[PDB]
């Protein structure tokens, strides 16, 4: 009762106690956030804009000004503050559900949205046919203004005329008899007033994003941990269809926010800020509230496109894997890429890049493209990865690691700079650059998890950070994903610089090779860097002499003589490596995840470019090996 109790209590503030409730409020709380805000707010909605979604606006504008009489009972009107009487409390008056939901932030957000809605109405920004919205607002303002002065109507009237604003939420129900001692909760950022454009777009953003947060809540709570052995106990399959229903109504909102992209049509009244930059609505929502993303984009996948989709007939059916796909985190935009590059988030992401880190330590151009293979442990790590640009030093240590966000940004910067490094290394070669991004991304993943054979020093450094002080890398693993999406889109954005707008449809949108073991990835890339080198060799000097393998040691001309020399040295190196990777595989990566196949079969099936899957001339690379040319390399228990 008399406790600390934000100043409302300890004020001798019996004034609000003497203040009663408005004659309005025919409801204090009806059904909250759900499918009601669609178009049922106005008729002839085309006026002044297209018909749009609304907050709990028509659901709470308690109407004590029934008469709309003269400004004689309306000197300070005693209702535009009285209607708000009732607040964060035992749990009613616009937020009733939070007491059952056990979250004060729900009531606080309801208060803030309704409050700024009243600010809008006082200034006048509504697109809905409401009597108070009509002249009565400015009529009362002008009538109160009738003293041959004060033509600052909105600025002076904005609460009444005297006390700044917002004094009406305090002393709610039971004088707001349920609270939290922190004044930051007890008073909102009243001082800052987002503009009316920002207010209506934030109306939209909240009214959709908070609902989609609760939609994620339905997705996680029910329709998941079910239909997977099992529930409840009949089948619980139809729960899946329920999200299909959610999507449906949400998808309407989809096209609706497209109008929000236009909003006049005039794409924006104002520009880049904490929640708004609006190249599109999805960018706003990503830039939007702390208790965001979008969403949860823009799923389940109808559109939200260009491709990819699932998505037909509908579904296949064969059953839909949205259960398996989305029951687990993913909780956010992965769906992506699609974007494909038609965006703004990339360039502002570059605005993040080379800033907060000004290339204060940056290496490129070692020309590892034209180099050979090296053991470095007796293990033959790729020259692709040998100088992979990422390394930390003192001032980036366990004591330094109290800024995981900044460290994450540094990792993104490293990946982006790596993208430019590959650009310079190939001198620009888009097809090669895409696979460059593939192995670089997946090897950065290996490092950040920490399994690399050649890495022995910065692996310990990243072990110092991110915890995991034992041999286990659990926290590093649970970091790597989910950071996979952000790192990969970072590298894709880096790649887009030369293309501008050209989707890497040739590649898997997210590199699937992330799943497979790291050593297998190195073998795959060295196979990819193999027998494309061979084709270049045939182009160089086998083109003129002659057509194929010569029928002796080698001679038709001195040039392709040297071509055969390079060939046999290259094959010698390949046989040594192929041997070491084969024994490594059959020993310690064979038949885990039940890969019943020899390493060359893995080479065949994982390859898709068809440059690999060699199949050499004077064949040494194939699905098998000579000396009993059947296959090998099987293991079991």
Numbering used by the authors: 1988 to 2624
Paper text:
Here, we report cryo-EM structures of the VAR2CSA ectodomain at up to 3.1 Å resolution revealing an overall V-shaped architecture and a complex domain organization. It is composed of a short N-terminal segment and six Duffy Binding-Like (DBL) domains (DBL1-DBL6) unique to VAR2CSA.
Likewise, the C-terminal DBL5 and DBL6 are more separated from the core, linking the protein to the membrane in a physiological setting. By contrast, DBL1 and DBL5/6 were less well resolved compared to the apo structure. The simulations also suggested significant flexibility of DBL1 and DBL5/6, consistent with the relatively poor EM density in these regions.
